[PDB]
Paper text:
In order to obtain complexes with LC-KA05, mutants E64A, E64Q, Y182F, R326L, and R326Q were soaked with the 1/7 substrate mixture followed by rapid acquisition of the X-ray diffraction data (owing both to the low availability of LC-KA05 and its high instability, it was not possible to carry out co-crystallization experiments). Of the five mutants, only E64Q and R326Q yielded co-complexes with 1; 7 was not observed in the active sites, as the acetate of 1 was clearly visible. The structure of the LkcE E64Q/LC-KA05 complex was solved at 3.03 Å resolution and that of the LkcE R326Q/LC-KA05 complex at 2.50 Å resolution by molecular replacement, using the structure of the LkcE/EMAA/DATD complex as the search model, and the presence of LC-KA05 confirmed using a weighted Fo−Fc omit map. In the E64Q structure in which R326 is present, the protein is identical, but the substrate adopts an alternative orientation, which allows it to interact with R326 (3.1 Å between the C-23 carbonyl of LC-KA05 and the R326 side chain). In both structures obtained in the presence of 1, the observed linear configuration of the polyketide chain would not permit subsequent cyclization involving the C-2 and C-18 centers (they are separated by 13.2 Å). This observation is consistent with the idea that LC-KA05 bound into the E64Q and R326Q mutants represents an on-pathway, pre-cyclization conformation. The side chain of E64 would then initiate ring closure by acting as a general base catalyst to activate the enol (there is no counterpart of this residue, to our knowledge, in other MAO family members). This key role is supported by the complete loss of activity seen with the E64A and E64Q mutants.
Residue numbers in the entry:
A (entry chain A): 4 to 133, 139 to 438
B (entry chain B): 3 to 133, 139 to 438
Amino acid sequence: VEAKSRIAVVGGGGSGSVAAWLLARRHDVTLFEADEYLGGHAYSHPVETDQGTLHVDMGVQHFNEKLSPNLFRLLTDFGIGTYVAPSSVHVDFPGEQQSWNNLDFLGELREELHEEFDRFHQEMNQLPTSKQMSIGEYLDKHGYSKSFKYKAMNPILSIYSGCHAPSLDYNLMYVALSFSMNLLSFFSAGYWRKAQGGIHSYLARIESDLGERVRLNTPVEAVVPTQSGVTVLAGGQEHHFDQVVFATHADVTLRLLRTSDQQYRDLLGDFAYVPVESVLHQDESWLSPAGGGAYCQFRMPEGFELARAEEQMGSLTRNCNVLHPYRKVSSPILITFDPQEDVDPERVIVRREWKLPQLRPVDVRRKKRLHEIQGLNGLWFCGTDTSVTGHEGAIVSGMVIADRLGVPHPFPDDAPAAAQFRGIKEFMGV
Amino acid sequence: VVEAKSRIAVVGGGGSGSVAAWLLARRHDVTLFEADEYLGGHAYSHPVETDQGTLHVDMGVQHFNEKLSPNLFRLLTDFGIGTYVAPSSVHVDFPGEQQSWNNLDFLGELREELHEEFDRFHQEMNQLPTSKQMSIGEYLDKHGYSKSFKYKAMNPILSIYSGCHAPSLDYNLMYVALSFSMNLLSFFSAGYWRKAQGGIHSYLARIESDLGERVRLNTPVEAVVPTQSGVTVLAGGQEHHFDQVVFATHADVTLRLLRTSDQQYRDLLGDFAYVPVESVLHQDESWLSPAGGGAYCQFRMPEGFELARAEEQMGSLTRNCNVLHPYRKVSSPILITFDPQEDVDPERVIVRREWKLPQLRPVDVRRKKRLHEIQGLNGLWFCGTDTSVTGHEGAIVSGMVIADRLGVPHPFPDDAPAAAQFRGIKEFMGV
Ligand SMILES: Cc1cc2nc3c(=O)[nH]c(=O)nc-3n(C[C@H](O)[C@H](O)[C@H](O)COP(=O)(O)OP(=O)(O)OC[C@H]3O[C@@H](n4cnc5c(N)ncnc54)[C@H](O)[C@@H]3O)c2cc1C
Ligand SMILES: Cc1cc2nc3c(=O)[nH]c(=O)nc-3n(C[C@H](O)[C@H](O)[C@H](O)COP(=O)(O)OP(=O)(O)OC[C@H]3O[C@@H](n4cnc5c(N)ncnc54)[C@H](O)[C@@H]3O)c2cc1C
Ligand SMILES: CC(=O)O[C@@H](CC[C@H](C)CC[C@H](O)CC[C@H](C)CCNC(=O)[C@H](C)O)C[C@H]1O[C@H](O)[C@@H](C)C(=O)[C@@H]1C
Ligand SMILES: CC(=O)O[C@@H](CC[C@H](C)CC[C@H](O)CC[C@H](C)CCNC(=O)[C@H](C)O)C[C@H]1O[C@H](O)[C@@H](C)C(=O)[C@@H]1C
Ligand SMILES: [Ca+2]
């Protein structure tokens, strides 16, 4: 792929935006984004409160310097601060005092499951130094109770996966690492950061630097390789490019792409997802009377039956008032994910509906296999479905494509950023 | 060349000695001399009589974890000794009204005063090991940190390790950076630490049993003299004769006991620096902080604190053992205060222990490493905390390194992190 080629980036989430941003240094880049902003799952909604206007992260919220070095470095270079936002967690179930949390040892569930929490930490710490099973399999295989599976493991895993997810089917190392890196924990609040004035700040900066190259509100309808180059059909027009980089979800990538080949069907067809509803609201009734200063608060509703555990599901609520920059703020600012009961519509600021990728061992395998179509027909692929999960994974896949199309990894000097890049470059087959 | 079935003495029955003896006894005729009336040294568990039974309360060595202490952890596992999590929740109180911070919530005037610096500090410690042979103190000065942060946050939280008498701010930076990046110490969460079931003594009791009458308690070695034939040890008004001698005593003890014509021995063992610690096991509930609720570790600085005189002044750390899981049904207060400044109500004191700890300044580390040039000369060997990395894993693995060197290989080769720790500590000592 020679210099100054005409290149399209389809999808303006984190992966696409970063990929575009880097590519624009060497190539004539156009970036198509379906919705009216840049960031995708990274969205920050303004809330005006008696102490000012605050941008509240509704999808992507959390990362840290160790897990997310490239994103972290990027935030730093753009002069965006961060702050610690510890993952304190409270779980409530139907009965009297049927709770645990990871700040104190109070609650009946904690009492019921403490020995298992204790064992679990040890075993997760011992794993990465020795197992292509799911967390669920592991738990069954190693003597853990069903109460532990569905009253502790599955709710704490909802911090990542949404309360609709079959999180217990997700890959074991994902969970083991989360516990050994103090991201999820039954004994302490996990070490996580947020970005100053919302996650969108970095994306706003990218949007500015890209200028007129960014086509918002322009959903690509299809993408067709030809003998000369690749044609993109978007917004009642046809545009002509030398290369096309996909930064869309596989099921979108597959619908849009229209080729004679059926390996494309073989690879992109079987990706599975999970719906998530993020409801930004001020209805203080969703806070737990027990769950005091806990950032993350899970409630399972009346009617929970352990026998029917796989069908039933709770809601996770985040108390943003516990964040340090919100500590002077007088209005409640809450986000409930996947609420089962409806939220008082007089108190709802806004909803967003999104989907997240399943992370079963098979899905990981499926992601990796996308290397055999990478570069064929002047097509490239980045996004969460090509990488490790989380935002670092998303955006670094963008960087991997840009490196592959000439524009090298911009932080070679940063040892952990570089290693993450090398690792993700190895994960994708690029 | 140390051939099989040689007569070998281990001088000192702390963790290092006991483990070293235990392994050596598989190949050699071992005797282990310990000065005091039990095996373990700083590892001491005192019985306390309570409404739930008899509890063994750790007074010195208390905490470790599977990641930091793989060999110790495996040993407990093989002996069938359980562990439990004992999160390091921390509350700091200073003289004023509400002059506190803690690592469970964001309450307190000191939290308000210092939040920005705690936040920055975590980042910077996480970024360090991926890039610096200075002290934590130097680092803090060099990187713009306030004196309030140095003496009201860093020095108190470092007292969890060093004792409230220590010049902790002069200790090595990587020691601190690692502690923060491994979630051992933290300003935002409770650190991940474990305790052993029925006290730390459990493993040592098991070692004592397996060694049998090879263990001489209450038998302080008076001196150790190499000769042409072997080495003579003078203890308990008698002389015993050995082919080799392994020291598991502190350098200043090792030096007093040892007597040779050589003055490199003086050069190496002479300049080791220590810190006193008083551990007071008691039931005076007045030492608990009215603010500091369910916090395991509670630091108090007394009235009279002057930031300008910060280097002379010092607080006391109190541990609320009633917050530990196995003590949750217990109705009597069980507290340990370390280095109390005010006196503890002697009607409520169960027992005191006075101990000393090694200083961990960059120079002290250098000093430890240099002990390789005397290792094996005159049929003498050296293990213990003064030869190794700090903490119990370091102590006991130094014992294992000597045993490996005297034939008995590292007993946990198939545990990858245990083996790597062994290799690392073998490299640290020059053995
Ligand atoms: C509720 C929620 C919370 C999350 N929280 C976190 C968190 O705290 N931390 C974290 O690390 N990760 C989080 N994630 C993961 C998140 O998916 C990644 O961090 C990252 O944002 C994924 O980026 P992406 O660019 O790969 O996909 P997306 O962010 O979905 O963006 C892809 C873009 O493609 C666009 N698109 C779709 N069809 C078309 C078309 N025809 N034409 C043009 N564009 C199209 C979409 O409109 C979208 O903007 C969260 C996800 C969700 C749903
Ligand atoms: C208060 C305190 C708390 C601590 N807490 C922890 C903790 O929580 N976690 C952790 O990992 N580490 C901790 N340590 C560190 C501790 O030093 C090591 O874990 C380890 O126990 C030191 O082992 P050692 O055998 O090298 O020294 P010691 O355990 O001190 O052993 C030295 C032994 O030599 C003996 N001795 C002295 N003179 C003679 C003589 N003439 N003849 C024979 N024997 C003699 C002593 O009686 C003693 O038994 C703590 C130390 C102290 C003081
Ligand atoms: C090697 C490395 O550094 O990356 C690891 C990935 C660990 C993830 C980055 C941890 C989770 C993400 O950071 C972010 C999840 C985020 C916090 C979602 C938040 N969601 C919500 O708030 C709502 C409730 O849904 C490796 C794992 O990545 C794969 O995706 C995973 C399936 C694995 O098996 C790998 C071991
Ligand atoms: C290789 C490895 O993992 O070990 C690291 C050191 C990590 C320490 C051993 C971590 C803490 C100790 O294990 C535990 C100290 C213990 C909790 C003392 C408790 N004391 C008390 O309770 C009272 C108040 O005195 C490396 C450091 O070891 C060196 O000793 C240190 C001086 C260093 O510079 C190295 C970086
Ligand atoms: Ca009860």
